[PDB]
């Protein structure tokens, strides 16, 4: 994929959900469908569990490498934590390429 990640012929399926309709008060017979419903919403919890396979880093580089570090000069807040209002703050993007390898 151009945006990134793993191209999959059969990716994780789509999981679709709706609220079943509950009609309002209907006192008569009509052959047109019921358009009057009780307004309602639903809530709940969803847990996802993924398993990942890892590739060990096996390298003979002598000197230290570049690491992703938490580094800020005079921080007024901590990054990747809630704000004083409760709003979660992420200042910078984090990619995967840090360790170095020869061609």
């Amino acid at each position: 994929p151009a945006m990134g990640g793993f191209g999959l012929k059969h990716p994780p399926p789509m999981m679709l959900i709706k609220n079943t309709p509950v009609p309002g008060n209907i006192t008569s017979f009509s052959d047109v469908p019921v358009s009057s419903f009780i307004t309602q919403y639903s809530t709940g919890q969803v847990t996802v569990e993924m398993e990942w396979e890892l590739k060990k880093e096996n390298s003979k580089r002598w000197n230290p490498e570049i690491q992703y570090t938490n580094n800020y000069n005079d921080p007024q807040f901590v990054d990747f934590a809630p704000d004083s209002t409760g709003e979660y703050r992420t200042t910078r993007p984090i990619g995967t390429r840090y360790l170095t390898r020869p061609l």
């Binding site: 096996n58 003979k60 580089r61 002598w62 000197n63 490498e65 570049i66 170095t100 020869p102 061609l103």
Partner: protein, 103 residues
């Protein structure tokens, strides 16, 4: 063979106690300089004696200059386990090519 120079006599003697070190890089952890079309192969003609080439590599440089980067890596070749050989010792290695198409 130990070589010594006194007032331009340049004598040569053989050191029977001296060692040579040999290792093969099985995990491909060093920069691989071989397939790049450079000199130092075994001669075409069997009687010919040849010098072994010096090992070296180029890492990342910065801004098309001679200066390094933070991702410039140093590989120490002493940090591989190697086999030490005196006069009576020998070294042996075996390799199986992976499946490729016929030329």
């Amino acid at each position: 063979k130990e070589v010594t120079v006194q007032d331009s006599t340049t004598t040569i003697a053989n050191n029977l106690t001296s060692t040579v070190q040999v290792f093969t890089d099985d995990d491909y952890q060093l920069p691989y300089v071989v397939g790049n079309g450079t000199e130092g192969c075994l001669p075409a003609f069997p009687p010919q004696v040849f010098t072994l080439p010096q090992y070296g590599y180029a890492t990342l440089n910065r801004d098309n200059t001679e200066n390094p980067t933070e991702r410039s890596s140093f590989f120490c070749l002493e940090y591989f386990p190697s086999k030490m050989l005196r006069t009576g010792n020998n070294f042996e290695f075996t390799y199986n090519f992976e499946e490729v198409p016929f030329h």
